[PDB]
Design an enzyme around this catalytic site. Structure first.
Site, PDB file in Angstrom:
ATOM      1  N   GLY D 143       0.856  -1.290  -0.015  1.00  0.00           N
ATOM      2  CA  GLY D 143      -0.041   0.041   0.013  1.00  0.00           C
ATOM      3  C   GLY D 143       0.813   1.255  -0.057  1.00  0.00           C
ATOM      4  O   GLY D 143       1.900   1.298   0.265  1.00  0.00           O
ATOM      5  N   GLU D 254      12.471  -8.222  24.790  1.00  0.00           N
ATOM      6  CA  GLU D 254      12.761  -9.389  24.947  1.00  0.00           C
ATOM      7  C   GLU D 254      12.631 -10.216  23.337  1.00  0.00           C
ATOM      8  O   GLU D 254      13.535 -11.228  22.877  1.00  0.00           O
ATOM      9  CB  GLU D 254      11.782 -10.165  25.836  1.00  0.00           C
ATOM     10  CG  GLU D 254      12.713 -11.542  26.379  1.00  0.00           C
ATOM     11  CD  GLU D 254      11.650 -11.892  27.643  1.00  0.00           C
ATOM     12  OE1 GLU D 254      10.955 -11.168  28.048  1.00  0.00           O
ATOM     13  OE2 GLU D 254      12.335 -13.145  28.255  1.00  0.00           O
TER      14      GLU D 254
END
Ligand SMILES: Nc1nc2c(ncn2[C@@H]2O[C@H](COP(=O)(O)OP(=O)(O)OP(=O)(O)O)[C@@H](O)[C@H]2O)c(=O)[nH]1
Ligand SMILES: Nc1ncnc2c1ncn2[C@@H]1O[C@H](COP(=O)(O)OP(=O)(O)CP(=O)(O)O)[C@@H](O)[C@H]1O
Ligand SMILES: Nc1nc2c(ncn2[C@@H]2O[C@H](COP(=O)(O)OP(=O)(O)O)[C@@H](O)[C@H]2O)c(=O)[nH]1
Ligand SMILES: Oc1cccc(CN2CCSCC2)c1
Ligand SMILES: Oc1cccc(CN2CCSCC2)c1
Ligand SMILES: [Ca+2]
Ligand SMILES: [Ca+2]
Ligand SMILES: [Ca+2]
Ligand SMILES: [Mg+2]
Ligand SMILES: [Mg+2]
Ligand SMILES: [Mg+2]
Lengths: 426, 54, 346, 438
Positions: D143, D254
């Site tokens: 897009g 993490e």
């Protein structure tokens, strides 16, 4: 709210424009008095793309009717859906254009262009967010051709970043009104190459051949040819007028269909074209739609290569079977699709079929075969121009020979640009 | 085939299993970028209106 | 109507397959860069497997198995046989081999010397051959100096000092078998093989002249002086080789050698099947292989190498290339047995 | 408790965001009106689900989301849909006309005029967070908005929130469900300018989601709704650790620590199983070994590629449902003996495992069958470079003729950005090969 302003100019432009509004008004449930009597919310979903809403739930086409003589727009105003048009949007003169591009573009047309732009401005000032403009006209006459391209030029100046779209009827000696058509067409193509973003080329010879050979019409009339144009126009605007998993505004269509700015001339095709109650299977629609005899450009696609293709299927049909058929046409005629634009064939589906049809297919192709249409015009043009035949009609309106030479060089360049990408390889 | 760091709670647990040991542009700069592109759009438009005025 | 592209203009095999495909009037050849194809006759090096099987509506097939190089690389094959539990380091049909990297660059240099010293001390035949430009020597000092003067990786394997010599002539030879693996990973063995015989008498007391030791068709037709004496083009086919085994050894090619060949082919190909199979893949692979074998005087078969882009014997191109179209291509793209199926557990 | 702000850019991002928050609500017991009966702390609380939902004094649980699109028709579906009550109007931003699948238009022309507004609205959410972790940005590659404006937003975010992680959920262009031809251009332009600003990006190839929907769910021609519900299942699997009590992938930092050894190579491969058709008569519930083995089948990968011929740098197994560590390690041991799992020599050959006892939630009336246990494997494989090759090749075919280039130059972009972006992708492909190939 992505509104489009429609302009129809000249005799051909208004006759094809009228039938187009007649066709889509029916599809959207609008009657000849502007009242909606449909049965589906899908009809009103994108209704504001082409229709304005007035008081009393009335829907008025966002259409501007232009001509330099009153004759044709009087027929419209008295035609089937003549009452539907906004009275203020009829802009016409009396002199006429005498099938003379210079009169429509320079003399008679300049005298009338400012009031057309006043109406254009009025329509644009009320659009929540204007997509762009679409013009219907012929290239072989004087008003639609000469004044038409003048209107485009002034619309470019005032709305430089809006999409300018045209349905352009190309002349043909077989369906000819005057010998000067190649002059008027060559001058218009020059304007179109420079100022439009997408032009659907409608060749009157192809429209004739289809009526004669495929539809089996002994003596075709202009009305018969315009039925094909109405049908084709309704098809190419289906994905603007109805909901679907496609969206597609004018600019997003141009971005994916026009790899090079000069090469924005499209060959439209439609199916079925039956002379009738028989049900047409998906393979039949796809074979027919892609057959040359189903194309309005009078160009053989096998004489060139498709840069890009966009197709729409209308009706309740196997969406899986549609992909299988489209993918089968490319992967079985790969020589006629350029291989350096990955996935250059795109298909969309709509559930509402045209009036009186279980299903149909419309497609537009940006094919280098279109060059043969411009070659034909260029040939007829030079045959007359080399002897300066009929030029006095134009020099009498202030034009100089050099302006004809420029338009010819530019159109011949266009042909060379098509021939360059027709031979291009990965 | 060893397990380590076994954690347990009421909504699940997590652990590690080992199978083998081993062997920017500033705000200003972004403005210039954008405004430069805007300028080139203005130049191209100017050449169109200049072409159309002729 | 099917479409294919050719990307190895030097493949004598798939040139004939290409010439056959077009002959069926049901296949259309595209430019080598057109991505809308059903079949790719791909390039030998850097075949772009990553772009296969992403064309909507196109079932795509390629004539190379991604990862088969682990088998058709001298060094890769040595490592595969030593590190694969299916093959183990005790594999009884592959000569003792060691991967040796040149000093100007893991490596098995010392491991090679340990075995060599054992052979020199035990009076046993201690001749080896190095290759990647080939050298045969009975002294370890020479083989290593040859790999250091080069720049690429080399392998050193035991030289079969007791090869089976055909008579008359007292001459060496090798056996080439062609094996086709289709998309279903069926292993097909072409019923026809060839022996590339040495036209010179085998001399075990001189590895300096490599014309009676190297049975390559190129080394025999260029340096040997008895080319084409015993058999046309130093090539003997199974019909003749089988009749010879009956007259001399009172045995058959099937019992004496062919059973072992079939076992070796299965063992190698089943070993890598988990790594290269295209069963559950977005594109399908098949490939023709050339296995090169050696037979010793005890009628024991040894695997020499596996060629991933093999040629074929002129007398056998027609039948085999038609067989590739029948089982490999038409099986996936049907239109409008010369092989031996080596059944196994998939 | 630390907050996570989700940003949905363009049609794909918005429609995927709608499908994720619908799922989040069903997972946390939140009704479309924002009420959450199980939440005993009214108007506040630092529970795990509060990383994604704030609370009003009236008891409404409001998503920490921003929806941005340059055209209003897709976000207007959120404004009047089932969950129109969850978001207040300030969270839904829409322009007047889109980027027409033109990266340059969404980045330069239109992005320039709406960027400061989107930042203002995001600043309103940041001010409600006592400890903002970072952002989750959903968008398509193809897009004009998803590619062009996202890259501009990512640049500004690195300026305004320097010490904040940013994760991407990026939709990789597939011809089967797209009518655009220029998406290879947008994909490479957006990856180039976003690369240094993204900490971890999960690419989802529409080709893969399409095939899973035809193959497993028996949908002849899947729609975006079918594709988005499946995608939200994977997103939920990936973000569940931030919304539920747990010990693995507890904060955005993490994901980079466990999955990205080198910053440029931050595109892990996602694999999900099982996908079962709800219309099915009745499926035999798969076991831990069976669903774990399915994580190594290309047919269940979010991007079709062959991990057998790459090398692994990290591998995370995220289970949901009836799963005990015993069954996982037993199934893992078996898979190592049968599969081609090759790690790089400078990484441990191990797996990080997370289990959440609550089984996968499915939208009522949807296409997915309710299963007792599911798993999503996040692995960093060099094999995902195949996706860059495919994309780079399509870019090369069109750029060799300069096809469509004028549309970008016309919006103010310089032709040199094409080659600069392409050369960056050529280097990215080289990095993947320096790690995986011998
Ligand atoms: N999986 C999935 N993909 C989508 C969805 N919507 C659009 N896409 C994909 O996104 C790509 C097109 O980009 P869009 O997101 O529609 O465009 P945009 O971000 O709104 O930017 P504009 O060009 O201004 O409209 C195509 O590849 C589509 O297949 C969706 O809801 N789900
Ligand atoms: N360990 C060994 N003992 C005896 N002979 C050997 C041998 N290794 C190789 N040879 C000889 O070398 C020849 C094969 O050489 P090799 O195949 O390794 O080189 P190459 O691969 O360039 C030729 P091709 O691939 O076409 O078979 C055989 O004819 C064989 O006689
Ligand atoms: N298809 C079609 N072509 C037309 C129609 N009217 C005129 N033409 C063609 O258009 C050209 C004449 O231009 P015209 O529109 O009549 O000139 P204008 O009124 O001055 O713009 C010739 O090529 C005609 O064949 C029509 O109703 N339908
Ligand atoms: O000939 C031209 C040169 C520049 C621009 C244009 C107008 N248009 C063509 C379709 S693509 C968008 C731009 C024509
Ligand atoms: O860009 C597109 C791709 C596929 C389909 C369409 C819709 N439509 C355009 C007018 S011609 C018929 C097809 C647009
Ligand atoms: Ca006058
Ligand atoms: Ca609370
Ligand atoms: Ca950063
Ligand atoms: Mg007329
Ligand atoms: Mg060899
Ligand atoms: Mg959009």
């Amino acid at each position: 709210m992505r509104e489009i302003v429609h302009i129809q100019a000249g005799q051909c432009g208004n006759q094809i424009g009228a039938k187009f509004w007649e066709v889509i008004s029916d599809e959207h449930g609008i009657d000849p008095t502007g009242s909606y009597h449909g049965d589906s919310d899908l009809q009103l979903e994108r209704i504001n793309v082409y229709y304005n809403e007035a008081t009393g739930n009335k829907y008025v086409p966002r259409a501007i009717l232009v001509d330099l003589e009153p004759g044709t727009m009087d027929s419209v105003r008295s035609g089937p859906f003549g009452q539907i048009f906004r009275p203020d949007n009829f802009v016409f003169g009396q002199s006429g254009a005498g099938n003379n591009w210079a009169k429509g573009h320079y003399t008679e047309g300049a005298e009338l262009v400012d009031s057309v732009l006043d109406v254009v401005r009025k329509e644009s000032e009320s659009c929540d967010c204007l997509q762009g403009f679409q013009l219907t006209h012929s290239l072989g006459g004087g008003t639609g051709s000469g004044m038409g391209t003048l209107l485009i030029s002034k619309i470019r100046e005032e709305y430089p970043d809006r999409i300018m779209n045209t349905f352009s009827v190309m002349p043909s000696p077989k369906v000819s009104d005057t010998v000067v058509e190649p002059y008027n067409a060559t001058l218009s193509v020059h304007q179109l190459v420079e100022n439009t973003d997408e032009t659907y080329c409608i060749d009157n010879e192809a429209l004739y051949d289809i009526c004669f050979r495929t539809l089996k019409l002994t003596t075709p009339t202009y009305g018969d040819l315009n039925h094909l144009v109405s049908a084709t126009m309704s098809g190419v605007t289906t994905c603007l007028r109805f909901p679907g998993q496609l969206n597609a505004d004018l600019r997003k269509l141009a971005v994916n269909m026009v790899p090079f700015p000069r090469l924005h001339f499209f060959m439209p095709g439609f199916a079925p074209l039956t002379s009738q109650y028989r049900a047409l299977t998906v393979p039949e629609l796809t074979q027919q739609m892609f057959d040359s005899k189903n194309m309005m450009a009078a160009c053989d696609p096998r004489h060139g290569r498709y840069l890009t293709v966009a197709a729409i299927f209308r009706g309740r049909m196997s969406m899986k079977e549609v992909d299988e058929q489209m993918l089968n046409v490319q992967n079985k005629n790969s020589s006629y699709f350029v291989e350096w634009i990955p996935n250059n064939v795109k298909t969309a589906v709509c559930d509402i079929p045209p009036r009186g049809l279980k299903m149909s297919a419309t497609f537009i192709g940006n094919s280098t075969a279109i060059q043969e249409l411009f070659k034909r015009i260029s040939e007829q043009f030079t045959a007359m121009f080399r002897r300066k035949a009929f030029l006095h009609w134009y020099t009498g309106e202030g034009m100089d020979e050099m302006e004809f030479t420029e338009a010819e060089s530019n159109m011949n360049d266009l042909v060379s640009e098509y021939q360059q990408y027709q031979d291009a390889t990965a | 085939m060893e397990v380590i760091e076994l954690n347990k709670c009421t909504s699940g647990q997590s652990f590690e299993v080992i199978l083998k040991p081993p062997s920017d542009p500033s705000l200003e700069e972004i403005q210039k970028k954008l405004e430069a592109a805007e300028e080139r759009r203005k130049y191209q438009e100017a050449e169109l209106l200049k072409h159309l005025a002729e | 109507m099917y479409t294919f592209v050719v990307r190895d203009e030097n493949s004598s095999v798939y040139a004939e397959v290409s010439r056959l495909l077009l002959a069926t009037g049901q296949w259309k050849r595209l430019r080598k860069d057109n991505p809308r194809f059903n079949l790719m006759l791909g390039e030998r090096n850097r075949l772009p497997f990553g772009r296969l099987g992403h064309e909507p509506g196109l079932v795509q097939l390629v004539n190379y198995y991604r990862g088969a190089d682990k088998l058709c690389r001298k060094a890769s094959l040595v490592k595969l046989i030593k590190t694969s539990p299916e093959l183990s380091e005790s594999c009884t049909w592959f000569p003792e081999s060691y991967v040796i990297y040149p000093t100007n660059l893991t490596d098995e240099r010392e491991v090679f010397l340990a075995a060599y010293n054992r052979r020199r001390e035990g009076r046993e035949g201690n001749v080896w051959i190095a290759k990647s430009g080939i050298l045969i020597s009975s002294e370890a000092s020479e083989l290593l100096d040859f790999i250091d003067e080069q720049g690429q990786v080399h392998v050193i394997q035991k030289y079969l000092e007791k090869p089976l010599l055909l008579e008359p002539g007292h001459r060496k030879f090798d056996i080439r078998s062609w094996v086709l693996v289709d998309h279903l990973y069926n292993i097909y063995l072409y019923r026809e093989g060839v022996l590339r015989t040495s036209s010179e008498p085998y001399n075990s007391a001189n590895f300096q002249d490599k014309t009676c030791h190297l049975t390559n068709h190129c080394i025999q037709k260029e340096y040997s002086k008895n080319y084409g004496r015993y058999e046309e083009g130093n090539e003997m086919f199974f019909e003749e080789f089988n009749q010879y085994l009956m007259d001399a050894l009172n045995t058959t090619l099937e019992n004496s050698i062919l059973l072992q060949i079939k076992h070796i082919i299965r063992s190698c190909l089943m070993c890598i099947e988990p790594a290269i199979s295209t069963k559950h893949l977005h594109y399908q692979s098949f490939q023709l292989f050339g296995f090169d074998f050696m037979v010793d005087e005890e009628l024991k078969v040894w695997l020499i190498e596996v060629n991933g882009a093999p040629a074929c014997a002129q007398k056998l191109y027609a039948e085999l290339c038609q067989g590739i179209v029948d089982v490999a291509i038409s099986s996936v793209f049907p239109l409008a047995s010369i092989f031996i199926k080596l059944h196994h557990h998939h | 408790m630390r907050e996570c702000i989700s940003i949905h850019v363009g049609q794909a991002g918005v429609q995927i965001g709608n499908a994720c928050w619908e799922l989040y609500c069903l997972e946390h017991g939140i009704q479309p009106d924002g009420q959450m009966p199980s939440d005993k702390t009214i108007g506040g609380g630092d529970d795990s689900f509060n990383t994604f939902f704030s609370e009003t004094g009236a008891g409404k649980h409001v998503p920490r989301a921003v929806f941005v699109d340059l055209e209003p028709t897709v976000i207007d579906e959120v404004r009047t849909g089932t969950y129109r009550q969850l978001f207040h109007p300030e969270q839904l931003i829409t322009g007047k006309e889109d980027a027409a699948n033109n990266y340059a238009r969404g980045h330069y022309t239109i992005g320039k005029e709406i960027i400061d507004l989107v930042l203002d609205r995001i600043r309103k959410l940041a001010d409600q967070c006592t400890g903002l972790q970072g952002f989750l940005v959903f968008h398509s590659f193809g897009g004009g908005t998803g590619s062009g404006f996202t890259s501009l937003l990512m640049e500004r975010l690195s300026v305004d929130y320097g010490k904040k992680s940013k994760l991407e959920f990026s939709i990789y262009p597939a011809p089967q469900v797209s009518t655009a031809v220029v998406e290879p251009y947008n994909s490479i332009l957006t990856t180039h300018t976003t690369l240094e600003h993204s900490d971890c990006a999960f690419m989802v190839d529409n080709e893969a989601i399409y095939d899973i929907c035809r193959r497993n769910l028996d949908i002849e021609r899947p729609t975006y709704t079918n594709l988005n519900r499946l995608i939200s299942q994977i997103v939920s699997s990936i973000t569940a650790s931030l919304r539920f009590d747990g010990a693995l992938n507890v904060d955005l930092t993490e994901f980079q620590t466990n999955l990205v050894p080198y910053p440029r190579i931050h595109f892990p491969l996602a694999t999900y199983a099982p996908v079962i058709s709800a219309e099915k008569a009745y499926h035999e519930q798969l076991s831990v070994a069976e669903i774990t083995n399915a994580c190594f089948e290309p047919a269940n990968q979010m991007v079709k590629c062959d991990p057998r011929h790459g090398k692994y740098m990290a591998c995370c197994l995220l289970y949901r449902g009836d799963v005990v560590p015993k069954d996982v390690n037993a199934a893992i041991a078996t898979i190592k003996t049968k599969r081609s799992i090759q790690f790089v020599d400078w990484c441990p050959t191990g797996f990080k495992v997370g289990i959440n006892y609550q089984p996968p939630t499915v939208v009522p009336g949807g296409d997915l069958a309710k299963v007792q246990r599911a798993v999503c494997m996040l692995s960093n494989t060099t094999a995902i470079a195949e996706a860059w090759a495919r994309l780079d090749h399509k870019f090369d075919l069109m750029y060799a003729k300069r096809a469509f280039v004028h549309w970008y130059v016309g919006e103010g972009m310089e032709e040199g950005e094409f080659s600069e972006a392409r050369e960056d992708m050529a280097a990215l492909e080289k990095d993947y090969e320096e790690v995986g190939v011998d």
